[model samples]
Structures are given as C-alpha cells and as structure tokens.
Target chain A: TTWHRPGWTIGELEAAKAGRTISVVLPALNEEATIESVIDSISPLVDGLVDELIVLDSGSTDDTEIRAIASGARVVSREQALPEVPVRPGKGEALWRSLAATSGDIVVFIDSDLINPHPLFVPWLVGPLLTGEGIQLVKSFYRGGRVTELVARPLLAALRPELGCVLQPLSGEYAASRELLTSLPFAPGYGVEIGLLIDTFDRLGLDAIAQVNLGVRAHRNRPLDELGAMSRQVIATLLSRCGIPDSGVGLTQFLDYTRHTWPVSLVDRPPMKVMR
Target chain B: TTWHRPGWTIGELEAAKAGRTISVVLPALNEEATIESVIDSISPLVDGLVDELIVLDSGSTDDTEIRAIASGARVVSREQALPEVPVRPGKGEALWRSLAATSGDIVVFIDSDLINPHPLFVPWLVGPLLTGEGIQLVKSFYRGGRVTELVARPLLAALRPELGCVLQPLSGEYAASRELLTSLPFAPGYGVEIGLLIDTFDRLGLDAIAQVNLGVRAHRNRPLDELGAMSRQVIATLLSRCGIPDSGVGLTQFLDYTRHTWPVSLVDRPPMKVMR
Candidate 1:
C-alpha cells in the first residue's frame, strides 16, 4: 500500500476511496447559534462518502437539540446514550458515547461551532484515512494564510517543534478509524482534542498520523481567562496520557503552596447542608 | 486593622467577625441525592460565622431544585439570574453567574454534591481571607485523595506542575474575594475551577493564594472518559491562561490526538425542541 503525495485535491482523494469509508460525529453543547450552517455545509458532501452523521449532545438547553434533529442527525445525549454507564455532563462524554452509537469504519468528530465550516472539512480529514493503509488518524489543520502564518505556526514551533511545519494542530476537525479510537481513553472537557492527538500518536506512533489543510475554520474566539483553563487541561491530558511524570515544572511548584484566611463581611447565615 | 484568628467553634469565629464576613455559594444541578445532608452539616456552622447562604441552581429536572428551596437557601436559576450575559451550561458558567447574584465581600463557592462535606471547609478557606492581609483567593485541597489523582495528578505534574499541589484543583470547592472573581472571566466547563485558581493566582500573585485541607470530598465518581475531558479542560485552561502559544495545543491538535471514544445512544428524546 503506497502512501499518496501531500496536498492532493478533494476530487483526486474521492477517486481513491476504495476501502470502507468514513462518518462525521459533531459533538454539540448549546451550539444552536452556528450548528445549522455547519450541518448544511458538510452534510451533502460527506453524505455518501461518509457512512453516518451523528450529533452527540450534552443536554443542550437551547434549540441545538431540535436543529440537529431537523438536520437528520441521529442526536443522542452524553449520558443516556452510553450503554452501561450512567449519564454525565461534558463533551468527551458525548464523543465517547458516539463511538458506541456510530458504526463507521473511519470516524470524524467535528465541533458544531465552526463559523464557515464546509464540505471540504470532510474530504480533508477523510482523505488520509481512506488513502493510507495503517494510518489510523488524520488531523485537519486550518488553511487560512493569516492563521497559518501567525498563531498556529508560531505556537506549534514553540511547543511541538517536532511537527512545527504541521499547521492547525488544535483544529477540532479530524478523522480516525473506529477500532483505534475506541481502544483509547477520551478526556471530557477542553482537553478532549489535544489529549486525543497525544494519546493516539503515542500509541500508534506519530508517523502513522497525517495532517491535512481544511482551509479556514472561523470559530468563536474564547476569552483569555477561558482559554487559560483550556490550555491547562490540554497540557495535563497530553502529559498524563504520555505517562510523563510531573517533576521540576515551575507550574508544579506554584500549585503546591497552601495558605489560609477569613471573610471580611460580618453577617450570620444558616448552616450549609452537607452530603453524608 | 488587626486580623484575629478564629477557632473551630462558630461562636468564637462570630466574635472575631467585625469588618467583613464570607458567604458560601453552592450551585446545584439536580443534586437531590446529597442536598439535604450537605445543607444540614454546613448550615449549623455557617449560621455561626457566615453572612448568607446562596444556592444557585441550573434547572435540575429532579427534586433537587425543590429540595434546595426547602433547605432554606436563597435559590436562583443558574441561568435566569444572568441578565447581563447569555447563560451557558456547565458548573463554571453557573459559578460565573453567581458572582453577579451574590453580594458578599468574600465568596466561597462549593459544590452541592459532596459525600463527606463538612463545616470545616468554610473556615479552612475563609480563615486566610479573614486573618491575612491582601489575600484575595484561597483554594481548598481535600485531605482524602481525589479520583483524578491517578489520572489528573501526573498530568498536572508534567504539564502544569504549578497547579499540581492544588489537591483536587478541579474540586468544585474554593473561596475567593468577590471583587477578584467578578473581574476575571470564567471558563464554562470542567476547566472553570482550575482556571479560576490560575487566573486569580497570576493576577494576585502566589502569595495571595492558599489551599486548605478540607477533609474529604466524595461525590459521584466520573467515568474514565468523563474524567479525560475534565482533565483536558483543566490543562487547556491553565495553558491558555498562562499565554502558552498553541504550537501543538490548538483544537486540531487536540481532536487528532484524542485516544478515548465512547458509543452514544439515546433512550428518550429531549422534551425541548432545538430551534435552527
């Protein structure tokens, strides 16, 4: 089985889908704001090529559930859908639940909030999974020149210099074989994407994974404070999955120190209820 | 201007409270199983030293909302109360909204689902805030080991050693000045707690923060996949807050490398309709 050249067009890629094909699983929260356009753009292209479209939801208070249902997506809750386990909240829980719910040879999980998400995301991710034998994972990088040149490129260089040339390492769009994915553990929160990549690469080797350009994925920009929590979980999942011991990290030193104090306000309140 | 030390007895602490006092805000999401017991244990202790008891709820389907209401808590919809910003689901979102709803000089946020929750949690966290000068934030470290210890600890040690000593850093229990918490943005996922600690510590300095030994916090043990997402968000929040470049830490990198995937199935459809 010969590995194809990089930068192949979607048409050229579609011609080569001889093996069992792919599916796209969009794990959603309250993403009613952007989910419809996302589904409209990607659903047609991946309809035949991809085996199924699964929308794993974590109890959306908004109409995200209804929209996903209207789009012909097989919507399921994070907890209710799991076969044996009780339901719990979180994105990874939804994704994990999707694994059992979806029956595709190759599984692609896309975030529901992409601003200009398109059909290309499907081919970009599934291309490698279809073309390369023993290639269990295909990561899709964003394809905007500005993002590639600015944030994604520079960040990759500093942190994961090994794959410095690889773009959009943090892009939520990617494809994987169901066999390999089910074998690995999924992190529940913002850490899901990064944690998945690190674990897959560690288990299957970095050489087995490939990166594709899915053009630009304009999504909501999270606040700096929110991003901080995301970064922490990403690093934590990567290090934990890799079995790297926590030693001599400056961040580690900061967490160990403890202190105490009291409240300044003076008021009497009823006792708090404690769980037995 | 003098700071006084208060003993375990609530009467003693009450006498020491002069200028300002603290309030514990427990945000519950269908926590009926443990709500009564939790309220009972802490109510007695809080009545002695604290100013108010607030239970912010996020539309629990079970009797949790009613139970909390009956427990004599100032219950508010985890969502409806947030008039300024559109409410997002998750514990972090609830906590963020609580900042606006609560009117305490010092605010201690605790989860409603603790198995061994005690009154000591309040004083242990509020002690430093009351007695020490210029201490804005105090995190609690559970004496009993966290379930994430086997998974999240090693990860933190490797990626974010600064937060590793936080002993259950993701523990939904901590105390902070209302001013500091409101000013900082909050992550709306499992990442919130750790994100709060990191943001607060970074802004206020490590000296301004402390961790108390709250005996043991036993709640529902999240499944491994759920834990993975929780761990991921924790690291993501830390890294994003720290301004670590996304080199290999972007959304693409995250999804590509994720190892764990679960099967999703739905037993019953959601009652509400998702509008497109």
Candidate 2:
C-alpha cells in the first residue's frame, strides 16, 4: 500500500472506490469537547464516499451523544447496539458492538477525542483497503505515541517479529473489511487495537496487512497511570494470543505506598461470524 | 519471610546468620565516582557479618577497579570470573560469571552506581535470608521508578500474578541462596533481576520469597531512550519464562523520526548447576 501515495484528493479517492460501501465509526466516551468538531469535519466524506457515519456511544456522561447527533451521525448506544449480549466498558467493546449496528462492507474507526480533527483521516484510512488488492486490514501510522514505543513495540519485537515492520500496532485510527473484522475475535477494552493487529497477522499473512502514513495524530496524552492500565491489557492480549492463559492474575500498583490490585481481563469476544 | 521484621542491626544479622556465609557482590561498570564510597560504606558490614566483598568489573575504562581495590574490595574482572564461557555485555552476564568465582552460601547483589550509600542495605537485604526459615530469595522495594510503575508492574500483573505481591520485581539490590541462584538460568542484561525473581517464584512457591522496605533508592534515572531498551529486555525475560520463545525479533525505536533497530537478547545463561 506504500505505492498508493499520500496526496490523493478526496474526489480521486471516492472515484476509485469501485462501488464498495464504507462505514465510518467513532467509538467515544466523555469526548464532548472535541466530539462535535470531529463529526462536523468528517461530514464531507459522508456526503460522498462514506455509506454510513456511526457514533458508538459507550454511555457517555457528557453531551457527546447530543453533539454527535447534532452534527449528523447515527448515534448507537452501547446497550442498544447489541442488547442480546451483556455490555462491557471499553473502546473495544464499543467496536465489537458497532459491527452489529452498521451494514457497510468496510469499517473505519476514528477516535472522537482527536484534538484538531483531520478532514482526510477517513479517506486516508479507507484508501489502502479500496486500492490495494487482497489487503484485509489497513493501519494508520503517525508520528506515534509512548505506549506503542515503550510497550507494544518491544512486545511485538520479541514475540511477533513479523510485525516489526508495522510502525504503529496500537493506532486507534484504522480500517478493515467487514469480512476480516467479523472473522476474528476482539480482545476486550484497550487490548482491542493490538489484538486486532496480531489476530489479522495470525489469520492472514503480513502481506494482507497494509499501513498508510497519516502524518501526525493529535489527541490527549493520557495520564501515565492510565497508560499503565492500557499496557496491562495490551501485554495480556499479546501473551494470551501466544498460548499463555491469564491464570487470573491481578496487577498491583502503588500510589503513596497504598497498593491496589487491578484484575486483568483476558476474555476475548467470539468472532461475529459465530453470532450473526 | 514477612515474619522476619526489619530494624535488625548488623550484629543481630550476624548472630542470626548461624553458620551461613554471605558474599556481597557489587556489579560495577564505569562507576569510578561511587565505587570507593559504596565499598567503603559496606566495609563495616564486612568487619563481622559479610564473609567476602567482591567487585565484579565489566571491563570498565575508568578507575572503578582501582577505587574498589583501594576501598578494600577484591576486584574480579568479568573475563576472570568465568574464563571457560565466552563473555557477553550485560549485567546478567556478569552475574552468571560471578557464580563461578564466589563460593559463599548466601549471595547479595548491590548495584555500584548507588547515589547515596545506605549503611543498612546489605543487612536489610541479607536480613530475610538469615532469619526467615526456608526463605531462598530476598528483594528490596523502595519508593519506585517509572520503568517499574509503567513496564515491569503491568507485565507482572498480567502474566505473573502470583508475583503480584512483590513490590519491586526489578530492584537491583537483592539476595538469594547460592543453591537457588546456581539452580536457575540467568537472563542476560537488564533482564537479570526479573528473570531471577520469576525463576525463584516458579521453583519454590511465593512463600520462599520476601521483600524489605528500603526507604528510598537514590540513583540516576537514565534517559527515556535508554529505559526503552531496558523495557525490551525486561519484557523478553518475562515472556520467555512463561514459555514464549524468543522469535529472534529486533526492537525498532525512533529518535526525532530517525529509526534505529536494537537486538533484544533473549539468550539466558545456563544454570551453574549444569555449567559448573
């Protein structure tokens, strides 16, 4: 997909889509500050190439749902998206639920907390899947983040060397064919991104995966403590994928010498193919 | 070994040690500034409690050996420790080699780069092994460092929850029965600490391990880039212990967008039981 250069205009990308339908999903929580602007910015793509724009709301306490609806997105609550199954709190859970709520052939996920919303993020993410033959998944690599550099990169380097070529294994902004997404299990919560990347690599060879440079990803730098939680899930997913069971271990962290043990969930949602 | 309380003076530790001989090993590399101070401060313990104080030098270009010897420590070169096995550049390599040179029943490892030398560190580390019945390992936990809080803590929480009670899995200052150290394989480089911790847990359940409250560990926090390298080896060692083989993957890190690939050492030195 590196052959598919970056400067393709929106019109050029839409024209080359070749009759494929695209669904853009924004998995969000309390992202009220940037939610409206993000939805408004992607409106242009929805007018042309995107078949559906969805805001998978995970019980946002803020006005995120109102603003997303106000800015023209089909809001699907976490409970309403898949009422048949119990709900879990995580971006991965929202993503798994979104599969049941949308009908597009291709799904694109965008983090709603993006600071300066990029107008071309959807088009850039969707570009490889549309143009590259036999590409089952498309990942966006940007300037990058610390968790990827410190945690995911090393984990992949040690266990999954083939994935070493992948720049950002945990980038939230990515696109995949519904066929691929539904066929693979989704690791709950923060493990979703890395879980998908590894599962795709496991099911399909490295050639099936493609990365597009999205320049810079501007979003809130989450607290280090929060990132620590994310790192546990990410590490759990990687270890679990490689035949190591969770053993029901809890992570103990310290704050002012006060120790707290947090449970690490290793349960992976079954493939959507089995459900629907 | 929580039954063995802290505040045991050097004399009490000496009395409780019974007939067990304790060898204090300082793994040094370019630690000229702090070598003499560390060795001198530890001299009081050597007067009665410690059987031998040896400095294992890893080919330091500085006067680390001169200062260590001047302060009355027997300086042994890394090459001199194990001439039979070819040497590798890492703390674990130095440790694995030290096993061949020292014959003490109890081995206490102290980092030579300690900023402010603590007079009671050796006694505190050796306290558990001396007083606790059947305890094989003793680890020291201080306030903490980012790598522990960010990388090691989360990794342990996910894979090795039985080790969750361990406050600092990566603390450089620790003591172990020579019988236990010689029986387990030592992971190379930065992985040495974590590898030993997990191996001890795997060999003799959690009860055989104990932790001491060291008020604070004063040491220079290496640059983040350097920590990134340490995190990789630490992750590699953890994964390897849990039955994941090193797939010979190299970790790629970035600096100002410039990419550099570093080889992660998953090679563990054979147990002295087999080698010796």
Candidate 3:
C-alpha cells in the first residue's frame, strides 16, 4: 500500500525548520472586496512557514495594494519588474513577475478573493516540496459545491483524462519550486494554471506533480459572458500549448457558421499589423 | 466604403413564419433559483417566435422541474429520452437527449440560471434560421462587464485571433436548426459548445452562423476550483476540436508541482454499472 499523508498543517508547517526559505505570492487585480480577509487569514500561518508574503498587483484600479499592504503583504506592480515582456494583464504575468521580485526556495500562490481563506493553504502547498524529493509542483483541490462537482468535474473528466488524477487542478492555491516555476513559459491570461500544469508535465513528467485538499475557499462565480472569454482563452492556450491548429482535430471539425450578411459598418477596420 | 455588415439582428431575420413550429429547450439541473424568471422573461418575447418551450430536466432534485412546469414549460427527463446513451451527466447530454424529446424546425438552448433573462434571446437565435438561406445555427454575444473586457478579450486577441470576432462565444444561449444540430456528433460534456461551433463551421461554412446581442444577462460567477475544471475542458475541447497534439504546439507544456501529501483519502471510486 502506498502510504499517503496529508501534506502540511497550518500552524505546525508555519514553524520553519533550519535553513529553508519559502515565499507566498498573491497575484491580484481589483481584489479589494476579499483581499483583506485572505491576507489576515493566511498571514499568521505563512509568517513562520514562509520568509515573506508578496502581493504582485496587475495594475488594479482598486485598493488592492492598500489592502494587501495592511494585511502584511509586500505589494509590487508586475509591470515594474518585467518591463520588457510588454506585461499584458493576467494572473500568470503577475506570478512570473513575482519570481523575479522575490527570492525563495519554494513559492506558494493563493488567490486574494478566498472568502474562507485559511492558513492551512500555504502549508498544504509547501509541505510536499519540503518533504518530498523531486516533486516540483503542488496543486490544490477542494470539495466545491454541488455545481462544480456535478457540472464541472464530469466535463473535465471526459475532456482531459490526463488530468483526471488532479482533484481540483483549477484551485487558486498552488506551491512550486522556484527553479521549476521560473524555467517554464507563462501563459498570458486565464490559461496560466492549466498551461503551467501542461508545461510542467511535458518537461518534468507527471510523477513530479501532486495535489492537496484545502477544504473550502469560497469566492464569486463568473457571469456567462466572462466565462465565454475564459473559455476562448483557455481553448486557445490549450491548442497553442498542445500544438493544435485553429483548423481543428480528429473526428472533430471547426464549425464556421458566421455567414449572415454582416453589414460593413459593424466590422472594425483591419489593423495595420494585419496589412503589414 | 468597404461595406461589411457583421450580421443581422434576430428581430430583422424571419424564421418559418407565423404558426411554424419552434422548440426552445432549456437543459436544466437544479436551476430552481432562476428557472422561472428565465422562462417568464423569454416566454412573451418568443411567443410569436417559438411554438414550444421544452425544459429537459436532467435529474434536478430541486424545484427546477416544478418551476419550469409552473412557468408553462413542457418538461421531460433526459434519462428516459435517451436510455441507450446511458445518460452521462452534462448539459451536452441533456441537449443531445432533447433532440429525441422535442420536434421543431428550429431548436434553441438557453441556460437556466440567467439573472436578466430577456425575450429577445430566442428571436435573435432563431431569426437567422427563419430568414432562410439554409442557416443552421446562431450564437450570442453581449457587452461583458469588467472581467470579460479586461481579461477575456485581450486573451482571445492574443491567442485565437480569428475567434476575436466572437464577442461571447461561450454564451450558453444559442439557436440551431434541428436538422443540422441532430446530424452533427455531440461531444459529451463542456466541449459541446466548442465542438458545436467548430463542427458547424466546418460543415456549413462561416456564412451559416450569426451572433446576437441579447443585452446583459447576469448570473453566478464560478469559483476558482470550478474555473479550473472549465479551463481544462475548454482547452481539451480546443485541442480535440482543433487537432492540436501534445508534441506539436510551441506553447504546449506540463505544469508539475509538489506539495504536502493529503492526509485524508481523496480517491473517488467508480460505481458499478446497473444493467437495465
């Protein structure tokens, strides 16, 4: 029997042993509503477990920076660090910036919008890296409400069977070794997490990954319009990451039904880049 | 002047004139919270638009069925309709089963949880079909809030540039000619929409599709966990639909990470199949 142990506990894991450095980075954008609570909940737990808590802001218009600072997080703009990368707004970009801004042997990222944020999240992510050999990344999964379990899970199971082992591959909480994280290319937008997972698995092999149950961390749901964009970005990233073409794949065909006589006034002028 | 009309509005296009049969299907599960409102809002608008309002219930343990019925929708269980397919739980499965339960020249699907359900949703979807020219499908797109514009739009622009034209490709509100929809093979889960879009595009050409602005329809936002599964499915669907393989795309990579081992068992056991 492969004896599996729960990765880390909140308080105990915070009490760092000799010579280990850990950092927690929260990639945030307009997260004022839930940032404070998240910062407060995890601060005590991560204070000891990690050497520092950094908040990488992606040009938020809200008081995310103020809230993060008040909650003991060292807030910094992602644009300030990666001036050359043409910092498009995204969670992945913020995360990548954090890599250059902070120095830690291991890094854990938690979303700022967690309603029931707990200290255990950090330890749960970092524990595997601390204890296990050759494990490069840790993904978190939780028992979401019935909607996710019934609607989302089964859909994912049928589509990406390779990720079937990951209970909550999309959970905002994750911990990864700096060496492993910095080496991989970051996806620009919503594709960050899955893109990261796919990238890591391709380079490091599946055995290097693990998952932890973080209990429940509630947050708001997305509207359909937003979900559509998310769906497109995710699909694009997957196709790009998987070496798939816009033309489509096996037993599947790209349906292009946009044939209604679209008035010329509605179409935007083609940009110079296309002409060039 | 390069006059290029993007697409025609739903009200402008005509379906099979007055008295022609049209079935609007709402594939639902636990949508009691807003199912009635959705039905009420769409009922009058599509009154002259559709002949039947069918609610295909997929084992909703809530008041979804009751409210749908109360709202004057014809309800049917997907399990009984497609007994041979073994009813895998998904909106797509429900939709696929809906083909057997209802008959009409045009079939449309509307999400149950729409907060701002409107009358125009159906007309806009079915109008193109009614106007003729063998138009088989219609998709919807609306001006999204902050998240969609800021996060989703840019992502699509950068990744799937062609899809950048689609304002809300992920919107669940859609209308299709029953003949075309039934002929195409449906991917069992979340991949249905993408699969449908891709398949329709391949078979019917870009001219057979149209997009409508149904105003703003607000609903629940997905939690990060749910979003992850959605992201994975969307990506997988894109790959499968777009024919991207693991080794081909430059952006393809795996995300391997390590975290503390979970103490509690997180394995899910598959249930034994009950022979009918």
Structural similarity to truth (TM-score) of each candidate? 0.49, 0.91, 0.57
| B261 Cα displacement, candidate 2 (Å) | 3.2
Candidate 2, CAPRI quality class derived from DockQ: medium
Encode model 3's per-residue lDDT on B1-276: one tens digit a residue.
Answer: 001223555445443455456888888889899889888877774556566787888889998998888888778898776676566766666777788777777788999888867666776676666765666788876532332333333333434445555655567888887778777766555556766776787677667877766756788666543444443344345445544432111111112233222111111112111211
Give candidate 3 misplaced runs (Cα > 4 Å). Answer: A1-18, A42-48, A70-72, A79-86, A144-160, A221-224, A246-276, B1-131, B134-200, B209-241, B244-276
Ranking by DockQ: 2, 1, 3
Residue A169 in model 1: lDDT: 57
Best by TM-score: 2
Interface RMSD, candidates in the order listed: 11.9, 3.0, 12.4
DockQ head-to-head 1 vs 2, winner: 2
Which is the better candidate, 1 or 2, if ranked by TM-score? 2
lDDT of 2 at A250: 57
The DockQ value obtained for model 2 is 0.50
Worst 10 residues of 1 chain B by lDDT: B267-276
Worst 10 residues of 3 chain B by lDDT: B262-271
Please provide, for model 2 over B142-179, each residue's C-alpha lDDT reduced to its tens digit, 9 standing for 90 to 100: 76266786788787777777787787889999899999
Candidate 2 — which pairs collide?
none
lDDT of 3 at A162: 60
| Chain A vs. native, model 2, TM-score | 0.95
Question: Residue A63 CA error for candidate 1 (Å)?
Answer: 62
Q: Candidate 3: lDDT over CA atoms?
A: 0.63
